[PDB]
Amino acid sequence: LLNMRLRNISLKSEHCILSSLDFQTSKASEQLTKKFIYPQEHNSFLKLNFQEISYKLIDGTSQIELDPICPLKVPLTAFSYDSISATFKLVLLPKSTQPHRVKITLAYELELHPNLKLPVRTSWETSLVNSKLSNVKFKFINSNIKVIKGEKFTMRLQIINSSSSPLDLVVYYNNTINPITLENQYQLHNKYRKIAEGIILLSNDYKIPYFADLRFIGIMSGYYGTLSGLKVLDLNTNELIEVGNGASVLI
Amino acid sequence: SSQVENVDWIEYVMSKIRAESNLHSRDFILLLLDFRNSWIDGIKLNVQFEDFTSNEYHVEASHTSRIIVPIKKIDYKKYNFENTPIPRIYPGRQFIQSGLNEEQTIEMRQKFWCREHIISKLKCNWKLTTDQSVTGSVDFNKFIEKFDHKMVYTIYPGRLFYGVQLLLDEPKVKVGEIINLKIITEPTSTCRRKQNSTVNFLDIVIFDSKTSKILPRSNRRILYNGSLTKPISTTKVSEINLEIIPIEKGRYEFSVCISKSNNQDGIIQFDSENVILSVI
Amino acid sequence: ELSAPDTRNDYNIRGDYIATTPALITFDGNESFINCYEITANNNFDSKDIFNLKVRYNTLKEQLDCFITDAVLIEGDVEWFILFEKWKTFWELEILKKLKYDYDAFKENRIIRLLKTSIDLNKTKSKIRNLCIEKAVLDKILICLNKVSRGIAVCNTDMDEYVRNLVPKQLTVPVQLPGFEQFFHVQFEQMETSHDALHDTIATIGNSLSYTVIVENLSGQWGQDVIDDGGYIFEILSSNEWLIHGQKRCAIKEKRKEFEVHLIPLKKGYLNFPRVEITNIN
């Protein structure tokens, strides 16, 4: 074995988990082979890695990678092509057969037949927030990453619960500073002074009765990921329910 | 920016940031108030401050509509807000002891006088929809219930301990311009409070425009000649200064923070001027 | 002040610190003092010269004692004319055992003495030939400085060119690396998400060994992370470099190395032996 490699599959909750095996012909056989080649007056080898594709299942299909693969042949390089893989709905882990081939055109144009094709198990190795009191769940129908200027915009929230008491929630945005190491002492304040100053909710204390279009305008600009001021609350048995979801860039 | 002049309260502060450029921004505040009707008819609701003209609103039978009225601040060196407090409608009476602390009397005077200041120029006007004849007004004397400590900070700047302003000349700086920053400090009408500390300490903190909390050793960033503590004089103006040699990024904000000692949590004013410069 | 070398080899400086009005510091090192200097380049770009600096420091126990020997005891043309006129060596023996407590010299006070004693000092003053008026002024000054405070007044009025300035010097000499090169990469944001709106860091690094590596890292973003796995073609120039990944990921790990320092040596054509790579979103 010469080309040392690793299998990296990264898991995302946008129903995607990409795969990019990294390869690098490391020093272990290089320290011997590039001194035999140094005795034979060569220090720029070229193993023509040009043929490589993946396999998904028993239907061994070449999945279309997100990146390209031309004739890659140089000395001491290292490559990691990224391939889009569909994320499963559960722990159905598709074992995979990583196939590759490099035709080792050595010094004095000496080709050598070699390939790197083997199989393993391609495990990854690892919107909505639920309630605390009721069966209520909160999601935003409009997409949680959205573009706007400093002007007005429409924002829309899902309320789905059990219809045993299907009512009496209230919103309020609570535009005041949470009053709160010295650089962290002026970091938590500058977090809170742009939470409570950025957007303003133009219909607060909105009685809900499912669907409601909540009404904001933002003043100053930035990335308001998990815009966390707004609080709905159940008027019986008052618990501070929070919706820490959604985002808004203002450029 | 331009073409945002489609929203009724923008163009007031645009039209006085174009002309009368001494009257700057980041000092205009918005007062936010929600109407709610206990009636079956629609109401048309044109609000006037001393020159602000809201457009033709509509409130149907329960639907609140938060009017966003822009005003300016008040200047603590222009009005005295420590004058005879809570003046009686008719003179005389028993003349009994107040029975309250002098400090409490100060905050009661401020929380009354700012309230009547925002009463005295705010006039709504309205008309019904289904009749279009029975116009009317309201008055807000029974409406505005009191102020609390957020409100008396936001209208009245003199409640704060210090008042600073801070300017950076020519905000297009390429790479290699060591440029002084100018800070003008003036203690407020609460210069009478403490007076046993005669020095207070002014941390100048550095924020990125997008991200936050640049560490103070600050390589590939602003380098500073001096240090960022610079103790300031109570009861007198003091022009601190620091020179900024920038290395490479896009844009930054400067702000200050006053801390009354150099121990932890003795900190008193999280002040927020935040000038931005643009670096190529 | 930073010193250009004795060759006078046209190394330009731009910044320099002359604290004329702010003759004021305190250096317990929990707070940080940083001085920075912007050296420029000459017609020739070399490595080694000599650099020195004129740190004109003092001591706080000189400054407040020169305040105490000129305002709190001897601020007259009578006492310093006849009472403490020729007995100043006794005052300069009395001063160096005072131990003024400097923990509140910059917290709402200055010149507040610590818990020494004064009866033995009064007995030593009585055992010499000190007069009654001079002992009256000295006992009044020590009685006032038994517990006292001060503002920031006479921060330079009580040492306005009446003090020594122990001008130190050192030697810094512009350390340099081994291998000099220049790369230029080519980014292409083939992002799995839409865009994370990353913020840039156009790096310019150095490496000082032989058969070595000069690694690098990509930009740092703050949106929904572990994504925007970019595409990159290397396009390194004027060298024989190495590689780490083509179409790598801008995730929690980046690891975009370039082990180019195992070959392709060159000259010291810059101020040091560096490499300034610069990607571009295409």
Side-chain angles (χ1 to χ4, degrees), chain A residues 149 151 175 181 183 186-187 189 201-202 204, chain B residues 1 4 6 66 150 212-214 264 270-271:
Chain A
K149 204 191 169 290
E151 309 273 41
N175 271 317
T181 47
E183 162 86 1
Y186 210 66
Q187 182 47 53
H189 158 71
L201 162 65
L202 287 182
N204 65 332
Chain B
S1 73
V4 85
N6 62 6
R66 298 175 59 89
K150 154 156 188 177
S212 196
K213 50 167 175 56
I214 296 170
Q264 314 294 286
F270 293 134
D271 191 359

mmCIF file with all atom_site columns, all heavy atoms in Angstrom, chain A residues 149 151 175 181 183 186-187 189 201-202 204, chain B residues 1 4 6 66 150 212-214 264 270-271:
data_model
loop_
_atom_site.group_PDB
_atom_site.id
_atom_site.type_symbol
_atom_site.label_atom_id
_atom_site.label_alt_id
_atom_site.label_comp_id
_atom_site.label_asym_id
_atom_site.label_entity_id
_atom_site.label_seq_id
_atom_site.pdbx_PDB_ins_code
_atom_site.Cartn_x
_atom_site.Cartn_y
_atom_site.Cartn_z
_atom_site.occupancy
_atom_site.B_iso_or_equiv
_atom_site.pdbx_formal_charge
_atom_site.auth_seq_id
_atom_site.auth_comp_id
_atom_site.auth_asym_id
_atom_site.auth_atom_id
_atom_site.pdbx_PDB_model_num
ATOM 1   N N   . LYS A 1 149 ? -33.924 44.315 2.483  1.00 0.00 ? 149 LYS A N   1
ATOM 2   C CA  . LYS A 1 149 ? -33.260 45.565 2.821  1.00 0.00 ? 149 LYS A CA  1
ATOM 3   C C   . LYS A 1 149 ? -33.780 45.992 4.206  1.00 0.00 ? 149 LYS A C   1
ATOM 4   O O   . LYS A 1 149 ? -34.361 45.192 4.942  1.00 0.00 ? 149 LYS A O   1
ATOM 5   C CB  . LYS A 1 149 ? -33.524 46.572 1.691  1.00 0.00 ? 149 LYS A CB  1
ATOM 6   C CG  . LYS A 1 149 ? -32.529 47.737 1.507  1.00 0.00 ? 149 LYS A CG  1
ATOM 7   C CD  . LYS A 1 149 ? -33.092 48.768 0.543  1.00 0.00 ? 149 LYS A CD  1
ATOM 8   C CE  . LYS A 1 149 ? -32.280 50.058 0.519  1.00 0.00 ? 149 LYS A CE  1
ATOM 9   N NZ  . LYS A 1 149 ? -32.413 50.859 1.770  1.00 0.00 ? 149 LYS A NZ  1
ATOM 10  N N   . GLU A 1 151 ? -36.342 47.719 4.762  1.00 0.00 ? 151 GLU A N   1
ATOM 11  C CA  . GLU A 1 151 ? -37.777 47.911 4.610  1.00 0.00 ? 151 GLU A CA  1
ATOM 12  C C   . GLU A 1 151 ? -38.580 46.783 5.250  1.00 0.00 ? 151 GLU A C   1
ATOM 13  O O   . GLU A 1 151 ? -38.095 45.998 6.068  1.00 0.00 ? 151 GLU A O   1
ATOM 14  C CB  . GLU A 1 151 ? -38.154 48.002 3.137  1.00 0.00 ? 151 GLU A CB  1
ATOM 15  C CG  . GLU A 1 151 ? -37.380 48.972 2.277  1.00 0.00 ? 151 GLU A CG  1
ATOM 16  C CD  . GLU A 1 151 ? -37.947 50.378 2.290  1.00 0.00 ? 151 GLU A CD  1
ATOM 17  O OE1 . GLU A 1 151 ? -38.354 50.897 3.349  1.00 0.00 ? 151 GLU A OE1 1
ATOM 18  O OE2 . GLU A 1 151 ? -38.029 50.959 1.194  1.00 0.00 ? 151 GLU A OE2 1
ATOM 19  N N   . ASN A 1 175 ? -38.526 44.041 23.442 1.00 0.00 ? 175 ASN A N   1
ATOM 20  C CA  . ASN A 1 175 ? -37.447 44.970 23.108 1.00 0.00 ? 175 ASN A CA  1
ATOM 21  C C   . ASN A 1 175 ? -36.990 45.709 24.361 1.00 0.00 ? 175 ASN A C   1
ATOM 22  O O   . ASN A 1 175 ? -37.340 46.864 24.612 1.00 0.00 ? 175 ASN A O   1
ATOM 23  C CB  . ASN A 1 175 ? -37.885 45.951 22.032 1.00 0.00 ? 175 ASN A CB  1
ATOM 24  C CG  . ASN A 1 175 ? -37.636 45.441 20.638 1.00 0.00 ? 175 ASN A CG  1
ATOM 25  O OD1 . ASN A 1 175 ? -36.584 44.883 20.362 1.00 0.00 ? 175 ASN A OD1 1
ATOM 26  N ND2 . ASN A 1 175 ? -38.587 45.657 19.744 1.00 0.00 ? 175 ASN A ND2 1
ATOM 27  N N   . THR A 1 181 ? -13.647 38.673 33.643 1.00 0.00 ? 181 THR A N   1
ATOM 28  C CA  . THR A 1 181 ? -13.902 38.851 32.223 1.00 0.00 ? 181 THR A CA  1
ATOM 29  C C   . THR A 1 181 ? -14.475 40.228 31.951 1.00 0.00 ? 181 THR A C   1
ATOM 30  O O   . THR A 1 181 ? -15.506 40.599 32.498 1.00 0.00 ? 181 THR A O   1
ATOM 31  C CB  . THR A 1 181 ? -14.872 37.797 31.688 1.00 0.00 ? 181 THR A CB  1
ATOM 32  O OG1 . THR A 1 181 ? -15.987 37.683 32.579 1.00 0.00 ? 181 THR A OG1 1
ATOM 33  C CG2 . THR A 1 181 ? -14.181 36.453 31.573 1.00 0.00 ? 181 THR A CG2 1
ATOM 34  N N   . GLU A 1 183 ? -13.933 41.585 28.372 1.00 0.00 ? 183 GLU A N   1
ATOM 35  C CA  . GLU A 1 183 ? -14.258 41.595 26.957 1.00 0.00 ? 183 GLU A CA  1
ATOM 36  C C   . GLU A 1 183 ? -15.512 40.764 26.700 1.00 0.00 ? 183 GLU A C   1
ATOM 37  O O   . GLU A 1 183 ? -16.350 41.136 25.876 1.00 0.00 ? 183 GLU A O   1
ATOM 38  C CB  . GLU A 1 183 ? -13.050 41.102 26.155 1.00 0.00 ? 183 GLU A CB  1
ATOM 39  C CG  . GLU A 1 183 ? -13.313 40.651 24.736 1.00 0.00 ? 183 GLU A CG  1
ATOM 40  C CD  . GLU A 1 183 ? -13.279 41.822 23.760 1.00 0.00 ? 183 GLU A CD  1
ATOM 41  O OE1 . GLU A 1 183 ? -13.033 42.970 24.194 1.00 0.00 ? 183 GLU A OE1 1
ATOM 42  O OE2 . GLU A 1 183 ? -13.474 41.604 22.553 1.00 0.00 ? 183 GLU A OE2 1
ATOM 43  N N   . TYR A 1 186 ? -18.344 43.065 27.768 1.00 0.00 ? 186 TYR A N   1
ATOM 44  C CA  . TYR A 1 186 ? -18.847 43.884 26.674 1.00 0.00 ? 186 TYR A CA  1
ATOM 45  C C   . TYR A 1 186 ? -19.135 43.079 25.410 1.00 0.00 ? 186 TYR A C   1
ATOM 46  O O   . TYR A 1 186 ? -19.397 43.660 24.357 1.00 0.00 ? 186 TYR A O   1
ATOM 47  C CB  . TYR A 1 186 ? -17.876 45.020 26.360 1.00 0.00 ? 186 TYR A CB  1
ATOM 48  C CG  . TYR A 1 186 ? -18.564 46.262 25.827 1.00 0.00 ? 186 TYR A CG  1
ATOM 49  C CD1 . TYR A 1 186 ? -19.424 47.002 26.629 1.00 0.00 ? 186 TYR A CD1 1
ATOM 50  C CD2 . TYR A 1 186 ? -18.375 46.670 24.515 1.00 0.00 ? 186 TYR A CD2 1
ATOM 51  C CE1 . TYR A 1 186 ? -20.057 48.131 26.138 1.00 0.00 ? 186 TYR A CE1 1
ATOM 52  C CE2 . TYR A 1 186 ? -19.001 47.792 24.015 1.00 0.00 ? 186 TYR A CE2 1
ATOM 53  C CZ  . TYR A 1 186 ? -19.838 48.517 24.828 1.00 0.00 ? 186 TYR A CZ  1
ATOM 54  O OH  . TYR A 1 186 ? -20.461 49.633 24.324 1.00 0.00 ? 186 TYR A OH  1
ATOM 55  N N   . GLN A 1 187 ? -19.100 41.760 25.481 1.00 0.00 ? 187 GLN A N   1
ATOM 56  C CA  . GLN A 1 187 ? -19.558 40.973 24.348 1.00 0.00 ? 187 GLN A CA  1
ATOM 57  C C   . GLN A 1 187 ? -20.998 40.512 24.500 1.00 0.00 ? 187 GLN A C   1
ATOM 58  O O   . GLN A 1 187 ? -21.762 40.556 23.529 1.00 0.00 ? 187 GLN A O   1
ATOM 59  C CB  . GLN A 1 187 ? -18.634 39.772 24.142 1.00 0.00 ? 187 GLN A CB  1
ATOM 60  C CG  . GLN A 1 187 ? -18.974 38.894 22.962 1.00 0.00 ? 187 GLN A CG  1
ATOM 61  C CD  . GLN A 1 187 ? -19.242 39.678 21.695 1.00 0.00 ? 187 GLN A CD  1
ATOM 62  O OE1 . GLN A 1 187 ? -18.435 40.505 21.271 1.00 0.00 ? 187 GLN A OE1 1
ATOM 63  N NE2 . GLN A 1 187 ? -20.382 39.413 21.075 1.00 0.00 ? 187 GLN A NE2 1
ATOM 64  N N   . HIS A 1 189 ? -23.240 42.106 26.299 1.00 0.00 ? 189 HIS A N   1
ATOM 65  C CA  . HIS A 1 189 ? -24.023 43.325 26.134 1.00 0.00 ? 189 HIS A CA  1
ATOM 66  C C   . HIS A 1 189 ? -24.202 43.687 24.665 1.00 0.00 ? 189 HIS A C   1
ATOM 67  O O   . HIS A 1 189 ? -25.294 44.086 24.256 1.00 0.00 ? 189 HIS A O   1
ATOM 68  C CB  . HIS A 1 189 ? -23.380 44.496 26.865 1.00 0.00 ? 189 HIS A CB  1
ATOM 69  C CG  . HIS A 1 189 ? -23.808 45.822 26.323 1.00 0.00 ? 189 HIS A CG  1
ATOM 70  N ND1 . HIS A 1 189 ? -25.080 46.311 26.508 1.00 0.00 ? 189 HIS A ND1 1
ATOM 71  C CD2 . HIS A 1 189 ? -23.170 46.718 25.534 1.00 0.00 ? 189 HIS A CD2 1
ATOM 72  C CE1 . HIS A 1 189 ? -25.197 47.470 25.889 1.00 0.00 ? 189 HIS A CE1 1
ATOM 73  N NE2 . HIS A 1 189 ? -24.055 47.736 25.281 1.00 0.00 ? 189 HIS A NE2 1
ATOM 74  N N   . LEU A 1 201 ? -41.397 44.304 16.142 1.00 0.00 ? 201 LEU A N   1
ATOM 75  C CA  . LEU A 1 201 ? -42.566 43.538 15.736 1.00 0.00 ? 201 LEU A CA  1
ATOM 76  C C   . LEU A 1 201 ? -43.762 44.473 15.691 1.00 0.00 ? 201 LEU A C   1
ATOM 77  O O   . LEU A 1 201 ? -44.169 45.016 16.721 1.00 0.00 ? 201 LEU A O   1
ATOM 78  C CB  . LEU A 1 201 ? -42.796 42.381 16.705 1.00 0.00 ? 201 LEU A CB  1
ATOM 79  C CG  . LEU A 1 201 ? -44.137 41.660 16.797 1.00 0.00 ? 201 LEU A CG  1
ATOM 80  C CD1 . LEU A 1 201 ? -44.461 40.940 15.515 1.00 0.00 ? 201 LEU A CD1 1
ATOM 81  C CD2 . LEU A 1 201 ? -44.072 40.673 17.943 1.00 0.00 ? 201 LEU A CD2 1
ATOM 82  N N   . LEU A 1 202 ? -44.319 44.669 14.499 1.00 0.00 ? 202 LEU A N   1
ATOM 83  C CA  . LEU A 1 202 ? -45.313 45.715 14.319 1.00 0.00 ? 202 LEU A CA  1
ATOM 84  C C   . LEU A 1 202 ? -46.708 45.298 14.739 1.00 0.00 ? 202 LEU A C   1
ATOM 85  O O   . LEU A 1 202 ? -47.601 46.149 14.767 1.00 0.00 ? 202 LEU A O   1
ATOM 86  C CB  . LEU A 1 202 ? -45.344 46.176 12.870 1.00 0.00 ? 202 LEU A CB  1
ATOM 87  C CG  . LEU A 1 202 ? -44.169 47.020 12.414 1.00 0.00 ? 202 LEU A CG  1
ATOM 88  C CD1 . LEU A 1 202 ? -44.383 47.436 10.986 1.00 0.00 ? 202 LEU A CD1 1
ATOM 89  C CD2 . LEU A 1 202 ? -44.036 48.230 13.296 1.00 0.00 ? 202 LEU A CD2 1
ATOM 90  N N   . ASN A 1 204 ? -47.370 43.296 17.982 1.00 0.00 ? 204 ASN A N   1
ATOM 91  C CA  . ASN A 1 204 ? -47.167 42.477 19.160 1.00 0.00 ? 204 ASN A CA  1
ATOM 92  C C   . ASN A 1 204 ? -48.505 42.295 19.860 1.00 0.00 ? 204 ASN A C   1
ATOM 93  O O   . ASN A 1 204 ? -49.493 42.954 19.520 1.00 0.00 ? 204 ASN A O   1
ATOM 94  C CB  . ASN A 1 204 ? -46.114 43.090 20.084 1.00 0.00 ? 204 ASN A CB  1
ATOM 95  C CG  . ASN A 1 204 ? -46.537 44.422 20.667 1.00 0.00 ? 204 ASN A CG  1
ATOM 96  O OD1 . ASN A 1 204 ? -47.314 45.167 20.065 1.00 0.00 ? 204 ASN A OD1 1
ATOM 97  N ND2 . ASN A 1 204 ? -46.016 44.735 21.848 1.00 0.00 ? 204 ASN A ND2 1
ATOM 98  N N   . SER B 2 1   ? -30.486 54.099 2.830  1.00 0.00 ? 1   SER B N   1
ATOM 99  C CA  . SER B 2 1   ? -30.147 54.332 1.400  1.00 0.00 ? 1   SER B CA  1
ATOM 100 C C   . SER B 2 1   ? -31.379 54.815 0.627  1.00 0.00 ? 1   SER B C   1
ATOM 101 O O   . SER B 2 1   ? -32.506 54.647 1.132  1.00 0.00 ? 1   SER B O   1
ATOM 102 C CB  . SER B 2 1   ? -29.561 53.091 0.778  1.00 0.00 ? 1   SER B CB  1
ATOM 103 O OG  . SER B 2 1   ? -30.562 52.105 0.579  1.00 0.00 ? 1   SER B OG  1
ATOM 104 N N   . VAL B 2 4   ? -35.890 54.091 -0.472 1.00 0.00 ? 4   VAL B N   1
ATOM 105 C CA  . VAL B 2 4   ? -36.594 53.553 0.731  1.00 0.00 ? 4   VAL B CA  1
ATOM 106 C C   . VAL B 2 4   ? -37.636 54.594 1.153  1.00 0.00 ? 4   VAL B C   1
ATOM 107 O O   . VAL B 2 4   ? -38.382 54.339 2.119  1.00 0.00 ? 4   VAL B O   1
ATOM 108 C CB  . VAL B 2 4   ? -35.609 53.245 1.874  1.00 0.00 ? 4   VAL B CB  1
ATOM 109 C CG1 . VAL B 2 4   ? -35.310 54.481 2.708  1.00 0.00 ? 4   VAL B CG1 1
ATOM 110 C CG2 . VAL B 2 4   ? -36.105 52.110 2.756  1.00 0.00 ? 4   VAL B CG2 1
ATOM 111 N N   . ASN B 2 6   ? -40.417 55.250 0.453  1.00 0.00 ? 6   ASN B N   1
ATOM 112 C CA  . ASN B 2 6   ? -41.804 54.847 0.309  1.00 0.00 ? 6   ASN B CA  1
ATOM 113 C C   . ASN B 2 6   ? -42.525 54.620 1.639  1.00 0.00 ? 6   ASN B C   1
ATOM 114 O O   . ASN B 2 6   ? -43.705 54.258 1.636  1.00 0.00 ? 6   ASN B O   1
ATOM 115 C CB  . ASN B 2 6   ? -41.881 53.624 -0.632 1.00 0.00 ? 6   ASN B CB  1
ATOM 116 C CG  . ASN B 2 6   ? -41.141 52.371 -0.113 1.00 0.00 ? 6   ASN B CG  1
ATOM 117 O OD1 . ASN B 2 6   ? -40.637 52.310 1.004  1.00 0.00 ? 6   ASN B OD1 1
ATOM 118 N ND2 . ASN B 2 6   ? -41.066 51.363 -0.972 1.00 0.00 ? 6   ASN B ND2 1
ATOM 119 N N   . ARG B 2 66  ? -49.250 49.521 15.288 1.00 0.00 ? 66  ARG B N   1
ATOM 120 C CA  . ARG B 2 66  ? -48.257 50.254 16.062 1.00 0.00 ? 66  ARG B CA  1
ATOM 121 C C   . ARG B 2 66  ? -47.719 51.402 15.231 1.00 0.00 ? 66  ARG B C   1
ATOM 122 O O   . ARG B 2 66  ? -46.975 51.192 14.272 1.00 0.00 ? 66  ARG B O   1
ATOM 123 C CB  . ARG B 2 66  ? -47.125 49.335 16.495 1.00 0.00 ? 66  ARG B CB  1
ATOM 124 C CG  . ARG B 2 66  ? -47.563 48.227 17.393 1.00 0.00 ? 66  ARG B CG  1
ATOM 125 C CD  . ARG B 2 66  ? -46.422 47.295 17.685 1.00 0.00 ? 66  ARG B CD  1
ATOM 126 N NE  . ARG B 2 66  ? -45.305 47.975 18.321 1.00 0.00 ? 66  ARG B NE  1
ATOM 127 C CZ  . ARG B 2 66  ? -45.188 48.120 19.633 1.00 0.00 ? 66  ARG B CZ  1
ATOM 128 N NH1 . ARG B 2 66  ? -46.120 47.647 20.441 1.00 0.00 ? 66  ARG B NH1 1
ATOM 129 N NH2 . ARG B 2 66  ? -44.142 48.738 20.141 1.00 0.00 ? 66  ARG B NH2 1
ATOM 130 N N   . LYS B 2 150 ? -35.959 52.249 31.349 1.00 0.00 ? 150 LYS B N   1
ATOM 131 C CA  . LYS B 2 150 ? -35.471 52.211 29.972 1.00 0.00 ? 150 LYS B CA  1
ATOM 132 C C   . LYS B 2 150 ? -35.823 53.505 29.246 1.00 0.00 ? 150 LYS B C   1
ATOM 133 O O   . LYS B 2 150 ? -34.968 54.101 28.570 1.00 0.00 ? 150 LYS B O   1
ATOM 134 C CB  . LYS B 2 150 ? -36.018 50.986 29.234 1.00 0.00 ? 150 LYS B CB  1
ATOM 135 C CG  . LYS B 2 150 ? -36.110 51.152 27.725 1.00 0.00 ? 150 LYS B CG  1
ATOM 136 C CD  . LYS B 2 150 ? -36.085 49.832 27.005 1.00 0.00 ? 150 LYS B CD  1
ATOM 137 C CE  . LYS B 2 150 ? -35.978 50.049 25.505 1.00 0.00 ? 150 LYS B CE  1
ATOM 138 N NZ  . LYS B 2 150 ? -35.871 48.769 24.760 1.00 0.00 ? 150 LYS B NZ  1
ATOM 139 N N   . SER B 2 212 ? -17.847 39.658 15.780 1.00 0.00 ? 212 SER B N   1
ATOM 140 C CA  . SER B 2 212 ? -17.632 40.425 16.997 1.00 0.00 ? 212 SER B CA  1
ATOM 141 C C   . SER B 2 212 ? -16.318 40.030 17.663 1.00 0.00 ? 212 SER B C   1
ATOM 142 O O   . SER B 2 212 ? -15.651 39.082 17.250 1.00 0.00 ? 212 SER B O   1
ATOM 143 C CB  . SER B 2 212 ? -18.797 40.225 17.965 1.00 0.00 ? 212 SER B CB  1
ATOM 144 O OG  . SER B 2 212 ? -18.785 41.215 18.974 1.00 0.00 ? 212 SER B OG  1
ATOM 145 N N   . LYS B 2 213 ? -16.003 40.767 18.738 1.00 0.00 ? 213 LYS B N   1
ATOM 146 C CA  . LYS B 2 213 ? -14.947 40.554 19.752 1.00 0.00 ? 213 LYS B CA  1
ATOM 147 C C   . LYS B 2 213 ? -13.558 40.277 19.157 1.00 0.00 ? 213 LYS B C   1
ATOM 148 O O   . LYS B 2 213 ? -13.014 39.179 19.245 1.00 0.00 ? 213 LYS B O   1
ATOM 149 C CB  . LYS B 2 213 ? -15.312 39.486 20.811 1.00 0.00 ? 213 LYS B CB  1
ATOM 150 C CG  . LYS B 2 213 ? -15.843 38.077 20.450 1.00 0.00 ? 213 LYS B CG  1
ATOM 151 C CD  . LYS B 2 213 ? -15.805 37.143 21.644 1.00 0.00 ? 213 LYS B CD  1
ATOM 152 C CE  . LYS B 2 213 ? -16.450 35.825 21.293 1.00 0.00 ? 213 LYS B CE  1
ATOM 153 N NZ  . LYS B 2 213 ? -15.799 35.231 20.100 1.00 0.00 ? 213 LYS B NZ  1
ATOM 154 N N   . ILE B 2 214 ? -12.986 41.310 18.540 1.00 0.00 ? 214 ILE B N   1
ATOM 155 C CA  . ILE B 2 214 ? -11.568 41.255 18.182 1.00 0.00 ? 214 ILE B CA  1
ATOM 156 C C   . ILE B 2 214 ? -10.721 41.293 19.450 1.00 0.00 ? 214 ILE B C   1
ATOM 157 O O   . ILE B 2 214 ? -10.926 42.144 20.321 1.00 0.00 ? 214 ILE B O   1
ATOM 158 C CB  . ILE B 2 214 ? -11.195 42.377 17.204 1.00 0.00 ? 214 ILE B CB  1
ATOM 159 C CG1 . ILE B 2 214 ? -11.961 42.180 15.899 1.00 0.00 ? 214 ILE B CG1 1
ATOM 160 C CG2 . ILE B 2 214 ? -9.706  42.431 16.926 1.00 0.00 ? 214 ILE B CG2 1
ATOM 161 C CD1 . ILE B 2 214 ? -11.883 43.332 14.948 1.00 0.00 ? 214 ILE B CD1 1
ATOM 162 N N   . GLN B 2 264 ? -13.236 43.788 38.446 1.00 0.00 ? 264 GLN B N   1
ATOM 163 C CA  . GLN B 2 264 ? -14.348 43.230 37.699 1.00 0.00 ? 264 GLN B CA  1
ATOM 164 C C   . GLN B 2 264 ? -15.658 43.784 38.241 1.00 0.00 ? 264 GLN B C   1
ATOM 165 O O   . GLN B 2 264 ? -15.753 44.150 39.415 1.00 0.00 ? 264 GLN B O   1
ATOM 166 C CB  . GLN B 2 264 ? -14.354 41.706 37.806 1.00 0.00 ? 264 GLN B CB  1
ATOM 167 C CG  . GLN B 2 264 ? -12.999 41.043 37.595 1.00 0.00 ? 264 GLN B CG  1
ATOM 168 C CD  . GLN B 2 264 ? -12.470 41.198 36.191 1.00 0.00 ? 264 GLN B CD  1
ATOM 169 O OE1 . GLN B 2 264 ? -12.943 40.549 35.259 1.00 0.00 ? 264 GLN B OE1 1
ATOM 170 N NE2 . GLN B 2 264 ? -11.476 42.059 36.030 1.00 0.00 ? 264 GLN B NE2 1
ATOM 171 N N   . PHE B 2 270 ? -22.427 51.147 29.375 1.00 0.00 ? 270 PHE B N   1
ATOM 172 C CA  . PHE B 2 270 ? -22.121 50.352 28.193 1.00 0.00 ? 270 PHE B CA  1
ATOM 173 C C   . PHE B 2 270 ? -22.421 51.219 26.980 1.00 0.00 ? 270 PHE B C   1
ATOM 174 O O   . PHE B 2 270 ? -23.430 51.051 26.299 1.00 0.00 ? 270 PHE B O   1
ATOM 175 C CB  . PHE B 2 270 ? -22.965 49.090 28.171 1.00 0.00 ? 270 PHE B CB  1
ATOM 176 C CG  . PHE B 2 270 ? -22.646 48.113 29.245 1.00 0.00 ? 270 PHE B CG  1
ATOM 177 C CD1 . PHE B 2 270 ? -23.672 47.526 29.972 1.00 0.00 ? 270 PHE B CD1 1
ATOM 178 C CD2 . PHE B 2 270 ? -21.339 47.772 29.529 1.00 0.00 ? 270 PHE B CD2 1
ATOM 179 C CE1 . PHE B 2 270 ? -23.400 46.614 30.971 1.00 0.00 ? 270 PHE B CE1 1
ATOM 180 C CE2 . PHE B 2 270 ? -21.058 46.858 30.525 1.00 0.00 ? 270 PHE B CE2 1
ATOM 181 C CZ  . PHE B 2 270 ? -22.092 46.280 31.246 1.00 0.00 ? 270 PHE B CZ  1
ATOM 182 N N   . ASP B 2 271 ? -21.533 52.163 26.705 1.00 0.00 ? 271 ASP B N   1
ATOM 183 C CA  . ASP B 2 271 ? -21.930 53.260 25.845 1.00 0.00 ? 271 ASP B CA  1
ATOM 184 C C   . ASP B 2 271 ? -21.673 52.847 24.395 1.00 0.00 ? 271 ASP B C   1
ATOM 185 O O   . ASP B 2 271 ? -20.824 51.998 24.118 1.00 0.00 ? 271 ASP B O   1
ATOM 186 C CB  . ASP B 2 271 ? -21.167 54.518 26.249 1.00 0.00 ? 271 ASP B CB  1
ATOM 187 C CG  . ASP B 2 271 ? -21.686 55.782 25.590 1.00 0.00 ? 271 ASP B CG  1
ATOM 188 O OD1 . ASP B 2 271 ? -22.634 55.742 24.782 1.00 0.00 ? 271 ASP B OD1 1
ATOM 189 O OD2 . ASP B 2 271 ? -21.167 56.855 25.940 1.00 0.00 ? 271 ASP B OD2 1
#
